[PDB]
Amino acid sequence: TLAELLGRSRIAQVANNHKPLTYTGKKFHPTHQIIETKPSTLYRQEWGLKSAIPSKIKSRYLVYNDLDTLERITTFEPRGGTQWNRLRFQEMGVPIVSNIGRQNPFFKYISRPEDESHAKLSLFKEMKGDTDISPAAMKKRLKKITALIRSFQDEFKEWLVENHPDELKLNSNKLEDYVVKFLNKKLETKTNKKFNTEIIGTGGLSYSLPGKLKNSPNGVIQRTVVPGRILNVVKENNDNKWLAAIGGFVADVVFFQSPPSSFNSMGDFIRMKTFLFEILEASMEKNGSVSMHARLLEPQ
Amino acid sequence: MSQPLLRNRSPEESELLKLKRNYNRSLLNFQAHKKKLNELLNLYHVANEFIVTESQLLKKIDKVFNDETEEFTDAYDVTSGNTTLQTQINNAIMGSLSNEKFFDISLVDSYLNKDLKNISNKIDSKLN
Amino acid sequence: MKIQTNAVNVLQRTSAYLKSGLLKETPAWYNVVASIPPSTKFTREPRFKNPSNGHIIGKLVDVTEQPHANNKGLYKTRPNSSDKRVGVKRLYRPPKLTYVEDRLRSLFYKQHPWELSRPKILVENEIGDENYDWSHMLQIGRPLDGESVIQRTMYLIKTKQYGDMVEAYDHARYEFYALRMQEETEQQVALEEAEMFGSLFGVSAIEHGIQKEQEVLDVWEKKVVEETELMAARTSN
Amino acid sequence: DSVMRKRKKKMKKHKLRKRRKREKAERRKLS
Amino acid sequence: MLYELIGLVRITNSNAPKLEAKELSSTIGKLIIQNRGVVRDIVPMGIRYLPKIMKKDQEKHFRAYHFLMLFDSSAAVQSEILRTLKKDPRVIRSSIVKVDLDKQLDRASSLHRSLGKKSILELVNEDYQSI
Amino acid sequence: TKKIDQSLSKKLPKGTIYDPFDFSMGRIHLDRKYQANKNSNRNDIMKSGANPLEFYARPRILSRYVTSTGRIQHRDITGLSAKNQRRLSKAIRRCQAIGLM
Amino acid sequence: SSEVQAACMTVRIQNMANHIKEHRKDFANTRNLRILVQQRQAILRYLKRDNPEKYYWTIQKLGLNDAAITDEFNMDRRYMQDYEFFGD
RNA sequence: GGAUUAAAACUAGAGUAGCGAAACGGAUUCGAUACCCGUGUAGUUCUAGUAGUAAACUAUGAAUACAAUUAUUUAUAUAUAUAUAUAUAAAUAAUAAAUGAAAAUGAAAGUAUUCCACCUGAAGAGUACGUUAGCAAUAAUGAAACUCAAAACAAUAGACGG
Ligand SMILES: [K+]
Ligand SMILES: [K+]
Ligand SMILES: [Mg+2]
Ligand SMILES: [Mg+2]
Ligand SMILES: [Mg+2]
Ligand SMILES: [Mg+2]
Ligand SMILES: [Mg+2]
Ligand SMILES: [Mg+2]
Ligand SMILES: [Mg+2]
Ligand SMILES: [Mg+2]
Ligand SMILES: [Mg+2]
Ligand SMILES: [Mg+2]
Ligand SMILES: [Mg+2]
Ligand SMILES: [Mg+2]
Ligand SMILES: [Mg+2]
Ligand SMILES: [Mg+2]
């Protein structure tokens, strides 16, 4: 049918997005899907959208929100520049590593309840992870849940007197433990936030596995040298490290001992010059940012 | 066109309808009655902080207007829900067999229904 | 705008010109239009089903069909106010098409934000030629991307290998990671192998960015200087 | 009615008020 | 009816700043409990500088001891308390606002409700279950 | 001169991604144009769900929605809903009558 | 049932009449009282048509008479003076 | 039929800062019984009444059934991968159709139904007389003769505008 075809159409494949096309806050990762048109189609203003893109657009990459609007225009920005940030990261050949030494999210590991010993930490995270929830929809998590949990009273009024009667007659320090486990055991079958929207690992920035060496005609490369730019002429206030602009990413540059004298000389125009840096490590934070650490390799 | 426009309710259908409607009215009255008793229980738990005698008044005044006591001066955004939400969760699961100082009507219902006693003996008999 | 009458009746108005004799010669279109009548009803048509999800439109659940109690514990014995409002408008409003895959697509790109940075071509080639066997993720003719995961997830739930959508989705995600890792290595190694055989490249991606940033930083230098001199004069006032 | 036409009624009302004030005055002296 | 009294007592003696406030709270509390009323809470608010220089009984003031008193009484008793407060030279400003009890019997003071604690049970249960 | 006004230079945060356009003057102007106090909601008690009328005895919170002279700010500036603006104004007027604001 | 509605209206009429006796210039609530009294007349007039026996029983228990129900009533100024609504 | 009913006004008893008919002065002016300025009485305020009039206007009586859209708020409800999304009403704005002399109306000034009030060329006239009500000012009710072929509305193009 036509409905089946539409669901699989290339336009349906693009997930709905209404995030501001002009965002002036902090950008940590791509927010819009880049659309590309071939040179032949660009010559005919064809992008596979509803309407022809104006001929003024010469780029072959754009990002859009709405196919059509009440203003009879498409809401789009003729830019595709987050792809070059990803490809420049690939050229730096620095694998992303976990600063906490967690399991690789891209491998199906056999995990155990080592961290599940915090059942009361995360079972209540469902009601306590409400930082940005409505004052009454979050309050609907109190009566709606209470009825659901109150429907298991009979089950827990028998299991507890059949598996741990001593605690019911001595102390509730262990009873509270049996309660947290009970609900989780009766909730694992349930589906509360069964889909987790948190970023998985690198989020797709890099699929490179650590360990491989870079062979070169001049021998194996031991230190990666990448051109960059120093943004500030004074270390980040309250931090012992300056900031550099390397390959579309802002890194923290650590200097060997002293800061090169071109800093004082150039002043606030220091960004006008290119320096060579060494990328020590790259980490991924939960916000979805990349923590790139560099070192200002100076001619010596 | 030949079909009758309306079919009157059979006497049996009217009986079942009346049963459901009486049940609906009775259930709502019962649920409101129990809600009121649960609020009366939660008010009893706090009536120890309320003053009805001069002796209580003199003790409250001293305890609040004392140099050691802290006063709400609202000069800074003091830092630190869960506590009151944990008492609710425990009183919903445990019910009569709860350890919370501020319990719900479940405990009072089990008492008058020979449940907290018919379980205490049951547990003790099991221990035997 | 009013439903026009004169555009669809050209044949009948022309026929009056010919019968009276005002028009001597029959127009060339006259016979063609007579054999192929225009559609002239211009009516609004009811619809009784959403083609996307098969939901039935125009069906009222009677109280006889709700014998059991509701979530509140009460029986339904009489129609409610909503049941007593005519719903003819729903028959005529274009149905909102919905798809389960849309929910998964949003999830995938929320979990993998950088997958958005991989350019997607919306221009179709020929939808009718797509002969895909979704037993495997890779397919000849289409790129490996988020859609590969979604279609794989649907095939798993359609074949009933997995029951929960989450489990099928997780299974597809790992297949996607494996294919993404094999490609990241083929590209790295291909570059390394070429340089070892004497391949030369003019400008690298990192170099391209530096040059573009220099062009912008040069114009910015001029303006800063100019605007740091107008301020000095204006402030001197 | 327009302001222009209202003005005719305004004049008639003014003359009636003026005549009734005049009559009142007479009654006071004649009384 | 539940009422919330906010009184600004005068600080005559800098050595005993919380003296007239204690004497006043006892006077008001005794009126409430002696006329079938209940005093639910007494929340001192401390010495605060008045937004301006205020006057009362041919006297001027630049500071006052703020205190809140949540009490339950009848409308007639509430008016009697307000009349006594409007006449006492110690009191500089006094306001009594009704606290609706239509939906729940146990309401905390506005100060506490502003901080998320809607009932006195929530305040007490956070001083026993967690203190 | 080795110095530039802060208004003529953009400081790229740490951990963020950038484009060559981020070093241009257009970025400076674009950031000024689209500079709105959108982070207020998370720091705005009255945009969180609390009832503004419960703050009638807390002048410090209420003083955040009045000008230097005590004039209540128009809803166009506070950004509150009609109900919260209505309740907030009542709270401030009641606070003024009690002798706290 | 009309008898129950009339009784429930009677309670509110009695309370509202007491309010008016202490707030004789509260015309907004006097209008409400008039309309409520007239509403009680309408419900009882229907009862007389539907179930005459219940009607006479109801009005006797409520303290009214047939004339009070059938006759047109406007709770006007003459009524306030002929029945000394406000006293003196 | 009843009740309520701005401002001004009136009957009593208080009040009277500011404002302010009138009055008396100062200016302006050919003159200035005005506009501007001064002094400023009634009034404006409160209590108890009288009176029932306004461009008391949306110049649009009330009720019911029904008819094509969009946008924007509000409310209720639903859902979740939790903050949006989906529903159903209300309000407002711009409209289709329809209606209309057109201006425009737009859920009515549309399609229909039910009930009430009101109109029948201008002027004379909301006047005269009578009656009713009011302390009073007045309010309600409400003509005819004579005379005329006028009178009025929307819109069009001009001319003019301190
Ligand atoms: K005066
Ligand atoms: K009418
Ligand atoms: Mg007319
Ligand atoms: Mg009626
Ligand atoms: Mg007015
Ligand atoms: Mg007088
Ligand atoms: Mg003069
Ligand atoms: Mg003169
Ligand atoms: Mg004057
Ligand atoms: Mg009157
Ligand atoms: Mg008149
Ligand atoms: Mg009139
Ligand atoms: Mg008006
Ligand atoms: Mg009506
Ligand atoms: Mg008259
Ligand atoms: Mg005209």
DSSP A88-107: HHHHTT---B-TT-PPPTTS
Whole-angstrom distance, CA of residue G17 vs CA of residue G60: 20
Instruction: For residue E65, give Cα distances in angstroms to E85, E113, F100.
Output: 15, 22, 12
What's the rounded Cα separation, in Å, for the pair G72 and F1?
Answer: 98
DSSP output for chain B: --S-S--PPPHHHHHHHHHHHHHHHHHHHHHHHHHHHHHHHHHHTTGGGSB-SHHHHHHHHHHHSSTTS------S-----HHHHHHHHHHHHTGGG---SS--HHHHHHHHTT-HHHHHHHHHHHH-
- What CA–CA distance (Å, rounded) separates F76 from G21? 47
CB of B105 closer than 8 Å to CB of B38: yes
Nearest-CB residue to B72 (from E111, E126, E128): E111
C-alpha torsion A233→A234→A237→A243, nearest 10: 50
Task: Give the bases of strand H that a protein CB approaches within 7 Å.
Answer: 1-5, 48, 55, 59, 66-71, 73-75, 79-84, 86-89, 96-98, 123-128, 137-138, 152-154
Rg (CA), chain G: 13
Chain B contact set for C73 (CB, 8 A): 27, 31
Provide the 3-class DSSP secondary structure of residue A116: helix
Q: Which two tokens stand for residue B49?
A: 């902080």
Q: How many CA atoms lie within 13 A of A101 on its CB side?
A: 0
Breaks (C-N over 2.5 A) in chain D follow: none
D12 touches strand H (CB under 7 A): yes
Judge whether E114 is closer than 8 Å to chain B, CB to CB. Answer: no
Q: What is the dihedral angle through the alpha carbons of A246, A249, A252, A253, rounded to the nearest 10 degrees?
A: 0
DSSP label at A60?
A: S
A15 beta carbon < 7 A from strand H?
no
Burial grade of C154 (CB within 10 A; 0-12, 13-18, 19 or more): buried
Could you tell me if A235 and A241 are in contact, meaning their C-beta atoms sit under 8 angstroms apart?
A: yes
Cα(C158) to ligand 11 centroid in Å equals 87
> At a CB cut-off of 8 Å and minimum separation 6, what does A194 contact?
C164, C166
Q: Tokens in use for A215? A: 């062979």
Nearest residue to C124 (alpha-carbon basis) of C141, C110, C108: C141
Half-sphere exposure at residue E71, Cβ-oriented, CA atoms within 13 angstroms: 32
Report residue C7: phi and psi, to 5°. -75, -35
φ, ψ of residue A227 in degrees (nearest 5): -65, 145
Do the strands A249-254 and A290-297 form a parallel or antiparallel pair, or are they unpaired? parallel
d(CA E16, CA E47): 12
If DSSP codes are grouped into helix, strand and coil, which group holds residue E10? strand
Q: What are phi and psi of F52, to 5 degrees?
A: -60, -20
Q: For residues C228 and C220, is the Cβ–Cβ distance under 8 A?
A: no
**Three-class HEC string of chain G:** CHHHHHHHHHHHHHHHHHHHHHCCCCHHHHHHHHHHHHHHHHHHHHHHHHCHHHHHHHHHHHCCCHHHHHCCCCCCHHHHHHCCCCCC
CA atom of G84 to C1′ atom of H138, Å: 32
Question: What CA–CA distance (Å, rounded) separates G85 from B104?
Answer: 52
Residue nearest to nucleotide H127 (CA to C1'): D16
Tell me which residues from 28 to 47 on chain G have a beta carbon below 7 angstroms from nucleic acid strand H. Answer: 30-31
Contact partners for chain C, using 3 or more CB pairs closer than 8 A, are: A, B, F
CA C221 to the chain's CA centroid? 44
**Resolution in A for the shown PDB structure?**
2.9
Helices (H) and strands (E) in chain A, counts: 11, 8
| Cα dihedral sign, G28-G29-G30-G36 | positive
In Å, how far are A127, A142, B47, F31 from A124, measured between CA atoms? 5, 12, 30, 40
DSSP tag of A259? -
Per residue in E76-86, is it b (16+ CB within 10 Å) or e — as a string?
ebbeebeeebe
What is the maximum span of chain E, computed from C-alpha positions, in angstroms? 51
Closest partner CB to B57 (pick from E18, E30, E122): E30
Q: Any idea what DSSP says for residue A118?
A: G
Any atom of strand H under 7 A from CB of A191?
yes
Q: How far is E63 from chain B (nearest CA, A)?
A: 13
What is the DSSP code (8-state) at residue F15? T
> Which of E69, E110, E111, E112 best tests the F interface by mutation, with the highest count of F CBs <10 A?
E110
Pick A34's closest partner by Cβ from C116, C185, C208. C116
- State CA F69 to chain mean position distance: 18
Q: Which of B17, B21, B27 sits opposite C73 (nearest CB)?
A: B27
What whole-number distance in Å separates Cα of residue B102 and Cα of residue E129?
A: 9
Phi, psi values for residue G71, rounded to 5°:
-65, 145
Q: Which residues on F lie below 8 Å from B74 (Cβ)?
A: 58-60
Q: For every residue of chain C, which 3-state class applies, written as one string?
A: CCCCCCCCCHHHHHHHHHHHCCCCCCCHHHHHHHHCCCCCCCCCCCCCECCCCCCECCCCCCHHHCCCCCCCCCCCCCCCCHHHCCCHHHHHCCCCCCCHHHHHHHHHHHHCHHHHHCCECCCCCCHHHCCCCCCCCCCCCCCCCHHHHHHHHHHHHHHCCCCCHHHHHHHHHHHHHHHHHHHHHHHHHHHHHHHCCCCCCCCCHHHHHHHHHHHHHHHHHHHHHHHHHHHHHHHHC
Tokens representing residue E50 in the block: 């008045």
> Which residues lie across from E96 on neighbouring strands?
E5
Q: Do B61 and E26 touch, CB atoms closer than 8 A?
A: yes
DSSP H helices, chain E, are: 20-33, 75-87, 110-114, 120-128
CA–CA dist C154, C119 (Å, integer) = 24
Q: Tell me which DSSP letter residue E66 carries.
A: E
Is residue C110 within 8 Å of residue A197, measured between CB atoms? yes
Give the H/E segment covering residue E71: strand E60-72
Q: Which residues of A touch C112 (CB under 8 A)?
A: 199-200, 203-204
* Helix/strand/coil for D12: helix
Alpha-carbon distance F74 to nearest alpha carbon in chain A (angstroms) = 24
Q: Bridge partners of A245? A: A229, A250
- Cα–Cα dist E13/E19, whole Å: 8
Q: How far apart are CA B91 and CA B102, in angstroms?
A: 9
CA-nearest of C140, C144, C133 to C180 is C144
- Residues 25-54 of chain C: which lie with beta carbon within 7 Å of strand H? 44
Beta bridge mates, B120: none
C77 with B17: Cβ contact below 8 A: yes
CB atoms within 10 A of CB E47: 17
Contacting residues for C149 by C-beta, under 8 A, at least 6 apart:
C104, C108, C137, C169, C172, C173, C175, C176
Rounded Cα gap, residues C172 and C157, in angstroms: 11
| Selection from E94, C105, A220, B80 nearest residue F99 by Cα | E94
Angstrom distance (rounded) from CA A153 to CA A160: 10
Neighbors of chain E with 3 or more C-beta pairs under 8 Å: B, F
Q: Which domains does chain E have, with CATH numbers?
A: 2-124 (3.30.70.60)
Closest CA to F16 of A63, A132, A93, A247: A247
Q: Which residue has the tokens 């009440």?
A: A70
Round to whole Å and give the CA distance between A46 and A52.
6
3 state DSSP class of E127: helix
H or E segment and range at residue A284: strand A275-284
- Distance of alpha carbon A293 from alpha carbon A279, whole angstroms: 6
| Closest nt to residue D24, judged CA to C1' | H137
Q: Which residues of F touch C113 (CB under 8 A)?
A: none
Distance CA E13, CA E17 (A): 6
DSSP 8-state code for residue F21: G
Q: d(Cα E40, Cα E3) in Å, to the nearest integer?
A: 10
| Chain A residues with beta carbon closer than 8 angstroms to that of F23 | 271
Q: Give the rounded distance of the alpha carbon of A205 from its chain centre.
A: 9
